[PDB]
Amino acid sequence: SMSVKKPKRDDSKDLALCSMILTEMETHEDAWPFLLPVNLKLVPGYKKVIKKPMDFSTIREKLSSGQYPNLETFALDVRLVFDNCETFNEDDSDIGRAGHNMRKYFEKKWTDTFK
Numbered sequence: 001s002m003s004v005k006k007p008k009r010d011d012s013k014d015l016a017l018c019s020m021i022l023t024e025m026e027t028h029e030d031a032w033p034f035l036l037p038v039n040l041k042l043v044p045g046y047k048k049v050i051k052k053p054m055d056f057s058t059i060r061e062k063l064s065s066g067q068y069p070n071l072e073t074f075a076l077d078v079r080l081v082f083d084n085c086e087t088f089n090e091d092d093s094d095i096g097r098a099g100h101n102m103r104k105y106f107e108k109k110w111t112d113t114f115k
Contacts (some may be wrong), residue, residue, distance in 0.1 A: 014071045021109050030098040054080040
């Protein structure tokens with residue numbers, strides 16, 4: 001509360017560390033469904049159904065331009081990518097499996113880097 005604070009966690013490396021995680025997600029062999037925004041002119045149903053599209057290139061631009069206020073807003077966009085994937089793609093599909101695999105890969109890096 002006012003004039004009452006928990007000890008200050010060092011957040012000075014968070015930007016660099018989120019960048020490194022995102023590089024690792026970008027370079028994973030199963031990243032291909034997520035590298036670029038879904039083409040809303042060419043994929044029937046996507047625009048109406050997926051209210052907030054998100055992809056790795058869009059996260060990269062937001063990160064690079066100071067549009068993430070803190071490491072949690074960064075994780076929310078990464079998770080949005082996988083939540084969108086599950087919304088639109090059957091589990092038993094190449095893209096569906098890619099999304100599950102990448103979400104697991106992300107969550108481990110996240111825990112190991114920050115928790």
